[PDB]
Amino acid sequence: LVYDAEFVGSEREFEEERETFLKGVKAYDGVLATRYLMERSSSAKNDEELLELHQNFILLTGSYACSIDPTEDRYQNVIVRGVNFDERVQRLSTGGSPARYAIVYRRGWRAIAKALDIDEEDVPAIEVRAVKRNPLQPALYRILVRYGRVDLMPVTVDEVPPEMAGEFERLIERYDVPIDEKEERILEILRENPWTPHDEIARRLGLSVSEVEGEKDPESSGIYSLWSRVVVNIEYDERTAKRHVKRRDRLLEELYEHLEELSERYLRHPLTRRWIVEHKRDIMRRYLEQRIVECALKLQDRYGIREDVALCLARAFDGSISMIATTPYRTLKDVCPDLTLEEAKSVNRTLATLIDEHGLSPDAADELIEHFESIAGILATDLEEIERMYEEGRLSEEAYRAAVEIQLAELTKKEGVGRKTAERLLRAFGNPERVKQLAREFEIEKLASVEGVGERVLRSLVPGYASLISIRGIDRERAERLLKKYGGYSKVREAGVEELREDGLTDAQIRELKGL
Length: 516
Fold this sequence. Notes:
The PDB classes it as isomerase. By secondary structure, the chain is mainly alpha-helical. It has helices at 11-38, 48-66, 85-91, 98-103, 109-115, 138-146, 169-173, 181-192, 198-205, 209-213, 223-233, 238-263, 273-278, 280-301, 307-316, 321-324, 329-335, 341-347, 349-356, 362-372, 375-379, 383-391, 397-412, 419-429, 432-440, 444-448, 455-461, 465-469, 476-486, 490-493, 497-502, 507-514, and strands spanning 3-7, 75-80, 83-84.
């Protein structure tokens, strides 16, 4: 399966990027060496200063990865497992660097390491998908890298705020970000355990992994997209960035200094940086083993896949189920030939949705998955872009018709909304998700300025709009004020009487609002 990229930046820019990449590899080797050590014994798995060091390596790994491709244009033709990521990024509403986008994926680093001709080390991996022992809220960790947030990524366990870990919730709240129904379901689970794995969440909510995740953009739906809304609203702080950059280099030497010292307690040979480079492959198969295996038995007992195949797919994808169900049939079959269509539908639900429910060829299905990754990715794409594509004939007739179907389907699924009204809306604002995002943001005048949009469609889209306007004495203009003022319906419902009478609302209105 193809991995590849091409560097198009200046000679001086070229050397800068390799300095960054090579440091990140040095940081990620920390994460691996600490893991090797703790699976050696009982005591090692329970040594406190060992867990703490493990985490500081993870933080530094994240920091250098934020620093890849600062000008958003040093690379082109980024391919991961046969798919061009340039195109992925350009269709997303905020665009951005396809290099950092590629690094969020298991094995994505291969594309970039080719372009930079990295050969100074065996298996020069940078990975950023650490879950159970992550200092930060995991999903958030990934989205900081995607937007190159050198400034926001902390570089020491000590400086990690409770708002990026323990109460990640305050961060959402501080920026008035709109959240949808599905997203509310997710956060429930995370409220008890913020380090709950995505597939486990998926199991307990009866949803596939891709619905849980979403697209790495504000204009989508899932924990990924939710975070993107947030991060894009924090303004960039040039000073912190500077501080982090001068402080980070020294830490990497200090941490390695700390590892050797501790390593002597559990071995007769110390873990020097030299030993690590020496025994790279040896050190990381220990990690990959259990990972691959825990994933092969899952695919058998939770998915009913023959043992030979389960073992094949696990290996190919470095033990990630997430990655497996973002992958088109033909390529899953390409590396695992005994794989039946039935069995592949069992792992990728997106696939089973367009075939069993919408009714397409496996060919058109693989098509849509290739260009847009998932159902969510189709909805995050502008209706007129879709057309432009088919215009120059990149989408097949069967594929083009289907995308148009799924997009309107997201609107016409509702109570009062019809075909042509949904079209005009996508024409005025681009895509469905931006429409729903605006409806949660309560911009009502802006929406009713479109022809076909009256109170019947506002009662269908804007949450708590029906609830508020059906009150006697309140009008549109007024509903917009109050929902914006307090943020959301229930925050009006549960507001204090002093506050609400301050807004000129009478007791008759308040009683009914509270519902007394």
